[PDB]
Design a protein around this ligand. Sequence first.
Ligand SMILES: COC[C@H]1CC[C@@H]2/C1=C\[C@@]1(C)CCC(C(C)C)=C1[C@@H](O[C@H]1O[C@H](CO)[C@@H](O)[C@H](O)[C@H]1O)[C@H](O)[C@@H]2C
Ligand SMILES: COC[C@H]1CC[C@@H]2/C1=C\[C@@]1(C)CCC(C(C)C)=C1[C@@H](O[C@H]1O[C@H](CO)[C@@H](O)[C@H](O)[C@H]1O)[C@H](O)[C@@H]2C
Ligand SMILES: [Cl-]
Ligand SMILES: [Cl-]
Lengths: 9, 9, 236, 236
Amino acid sequence: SAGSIPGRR
Amino acid sequence: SAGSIPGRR
Amino acid sequence: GAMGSMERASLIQKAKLAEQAERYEDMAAFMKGAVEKGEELSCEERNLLSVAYKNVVGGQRAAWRVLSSIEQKSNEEGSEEKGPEVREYREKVETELQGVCDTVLGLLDSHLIKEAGDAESRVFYLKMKGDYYRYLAEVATGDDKKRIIDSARSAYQEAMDISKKEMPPTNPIRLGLALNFSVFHYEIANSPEEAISLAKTTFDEAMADLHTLSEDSYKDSTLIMQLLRDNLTLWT
Amino acid sequence: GAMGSMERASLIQKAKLAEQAERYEDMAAFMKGAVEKGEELSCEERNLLSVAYKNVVGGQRAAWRVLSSIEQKSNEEGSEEKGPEVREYREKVETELQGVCDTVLGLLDSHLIKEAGDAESRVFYLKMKGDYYRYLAEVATGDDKKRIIDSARSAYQEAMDISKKEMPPTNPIRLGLALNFSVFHYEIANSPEEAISLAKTTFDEAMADLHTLSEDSYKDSTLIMQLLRDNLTLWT
Ligand SMILES: COC[C@H]1CC[C@@H]2/C1=C\[C@@]1(C)CCC(C(C)C)=C1[C@@H](O[C@H]1O[C@H](CO)[C@@H](O)[C@H](O)[C@H]1O)[C@H](O)[C@@H]2C
Ligand SMILES: COC[C@H]1CC[C@@H]2/C1=C\[C@@]1(C)CCC(C(C)C)=C1[C@@H](O[C@H]1O[C@H](CO)[C@@H](O)[C@H](O)[C@H]1O)[C@H](O)[C@@H]2C
Ligand SMILES: [Cl-]
Ligand SMILES: [Cl-]
């Protein structure tokens, strides 16, 4: 739901 | 290059 | 095999879950287990088998093409020597791809094709045999490349002969076989004119049979017809 | 391990090829081999380690969420009994995901964290430790869920303390740590107000430090700042 880093490519 | 069937999803 | 203890119906159920989850290696392993139960596959089950392995080999083929392009560039004039690693890793991916193709061909030979009597099953499996020999041919470079190509051609040709006798020109299996055999001609067999002729004739004969179809069948057939048209536009 | 016979430099080279080929399981295996050589990792190498495992676990997490949603629906009133298969397959994917998280945590504990003295390495690894305990927490339901959550919180907190003392507010590692710790608060720890406060303070303190940066550093920091803003917009 929320954005995290790294993300999926 | 050319299209075949099935393809990748 | 590792799926030997799982019920056939449970393997099919899990193959469907794996598809929803985009877990194509699992999907393929479940479908391999289902085939190895020894019973014929239904139309839906054949489709699951095809989708699962196409997604697996598709990732391998895409990776192989990336690595082969890097390897080709490394062998150009002025390119700095970087050691054996690109070749090694291309070979690793290649060997894995070949193993998947061999697995599919093995399921077809033991014993899906020999038990397939209806045109819809037999053409489907012979097309698959052509496709996976075609993927082997894409990476072949040794004394057996010609035999691999001829194995792909032979499977496609038997499928073509049956499909023309037993299926209408709009049948989606017949259309997809023709599409892929045409790609074989263009990309593998160095026969672009045959590829173009096959795609054109297939498209035109399907066009002329659309009037016989329901709305849903029409949508199914015209989808594949558009792929034929796309290739013709690319090739001419 | 299976990479024990391959040179460190060759493992790094192949990890880069695997990334280009979108072969993330291979990439992760090469990077695990590189870590197991026992030397510290450079900044670029840490980034490769992070990207490889994030892509692997990301596929597993997405699959787990699909399967868990199907399983939850199956347990609703009026849903037909379909047997143990959905639970079994969710458990299979879960166990695989846990194995990847345990592998990452094992590399961090043996011995990346203990040898990491510079803030850029130590914060990076402690953030990773928080992240992979967070992924374990997402699937946990037993007597150890609270301890898993506290392990994620403890790793993130140590990373936060170091980052605030040793890094500028625009440092991308500091920003990404804050972003992910805020997601932990919102999604894992049932602390949306803490999540929002952390994201806001982080964003504002970074804004105030952008004037010190080059154009390239500015682009790097503002990218992550936008992710903070996106979460704030979602959460408020
Ligand atoms: C051995 O070579 C198999 C291919 C020959 C043509 C094509 C082949 C493969 C697949 C299974 C995947 C792509 C498509 C459709 C979307 C073109 C199908 C199938 O389509 C069936 O299965 C797919 C997937 O479940 C569904 O989306 C369709 O609704 C269904 O009709 C279609 O009827 C024939 C079997
Ligand atoms: C342990 O948590 C690691 C994350 C903390 C924040 C972020 C983290 C992970 C990665 C490696 C992947 C996403 C990004 C960028 C694109 C946001 C980076 C990295 O960015 C570096 O590496 C990526 C990938 O090679 C490059 O695209 C960037 O140009 C490079 O600066 C950036 O400096 C910090 C390290
Ligand atoms: Cl290799
Ligand atoms: Cl299972």
